[PDB]
């Protein structure tokens, strides 16, 4: 059963949570190939592990930049959580380490690129296409939430497509293990629940709201709340009104009304029956949840492949150096990393 699987998953997780792996490789064991993404919150690089020739995605954070952004605790969260999890639609840490300058997290490489890239190019996904991805998110959240983890940054930019067309939920920079309410203003404007915008204490229900935004954007091709500036976006989100495209099915509209629900007592995922309100909704009627988890379902789209370590599904970013100071930076701040 589901409850049995999750019980065992939690036991596996907690052992790694209470005794995190630390300093399990070194930069010089990897060959840097290409920058896969970059921004103020660090970068992800394709690297080759020398001893095996395996390819990995390596997230690199500059410790000093982390400190300036006040993301020390959040970064320790990300590493501590990712080294402890194990799930078909997550990329756990294979290795992690740090040097004088940077923090490194090495995980499975997904060569199909960001969902964001394909969604924008293709324009929108068909409902069955959207549903295939949504299913994997539903299961991943069921997993994370059962471990008391809140994810807090669902978006196409943080969803990677693997060689078989399945998804990896990446970017755990705002992920937190919390049993009660929490208060941090974080996320991405288009995906923020009303609770967050209005500076209330919130819980894992914000992830289920975020799922509503994702499913909408996947099926529509644009988000349900968009504008040129974040402030105009927040006004729309709190307003309590959403418009659906005429091509949206009845079932899709109804699922979304129940996900994009300002009222926490009625928002799907949050209620007495939990995730089963979502799993048992008419829109997911054709969804074989075990087949999704088992990866037996045929993906409606598979990315173009041309070999191992191919990067054609990713954009091109300017390659910056990986600089390592001769002096140790922020040692005490990141001692547990």
């Amino acid at each position: 059963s589901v409850k049995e699987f999750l019980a065992k998953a939690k036991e596996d997780f907690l052992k790694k949570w209470e005794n995190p792996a630390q300093n399990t490789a070194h930069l010089d064991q990897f060959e840097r190939i290409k920058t896969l993404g970059t921004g103020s919150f660090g970068r992800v690089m394709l690297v080759k592990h020398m001893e095996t020739g395996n390819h990995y995605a390596m997230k690199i954070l500059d410790k000093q930049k982390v400190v300036k952004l006040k993301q020390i605790e959040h970064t320790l969260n990300e590493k501590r959580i990712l080294q402890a999890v194990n799930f078909p639609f997550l990329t756990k840490l294979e290795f992690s380490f740090k040097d004088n300058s940077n923090l490194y997290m090495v995980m499975e490489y997904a060569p199909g690129g960001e969902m964001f890239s394909h969604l924008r190019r293709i324009g929108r996904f068909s409902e069955p296409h959207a549903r295939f991805y949504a299913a994997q998110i539903v299961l991943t959240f069921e997993y994370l939430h059962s471990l008391d983890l809140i994810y807090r940054d669902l978006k196409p930019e943080n969803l990677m497509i693997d060689q078989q067309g399945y998804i990896k939920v990446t970017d755990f920079g705002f992920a937190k293990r919390v049993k009660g309410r929490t208060w941090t203003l974080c996320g991405t404007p288009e995906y923020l629940a009303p609770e967050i915008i209005l500076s209330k204490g919130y819980n894992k229900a914000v992830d289920w709201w975020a799922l509503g935004v994702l499913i909408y954007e996947m099926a529509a091709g644009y988000p349900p709340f968009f504008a040129d500036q974040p402030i105009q976006i927040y006004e729309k989100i709190v307003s309590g009104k959403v418009r659906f495209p005429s091509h949206f099915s009845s079932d899709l509209k109804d699922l979304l009304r129940n996900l994009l629900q300002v009222d926490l007592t009625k928002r799907f995922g949050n209620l007495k029956n939990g995730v089963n309100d979502i799993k048992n909704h008419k829109w997911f009627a054709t969804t074989d949840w075990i087949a999704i988890y088992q990866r037996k379902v045929e993906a409606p789209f598979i990315p173009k492949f041309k070999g191992p370590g191919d990067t054609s599904n990713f954009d091109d970013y300017e390659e910056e150096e990986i600089r390592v100071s001769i002096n140790e930076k922020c040692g005490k701040e990141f001692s547990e990393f």
């Binding site: 940054d153 930019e157 203003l185 991405t188 968009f226």
Partner: peptide
């Protein structure tokens, strides 16, 4: 159209996280 309005907007690229 809503699509036209989205595509003409300044937020069709990769969206950054926010924070305090």
């Amino acid at each position: 159209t809503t699509y036209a309005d989205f595509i003409a907007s300044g937020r069709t690229g990769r969206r950054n996280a926010i924070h305090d």
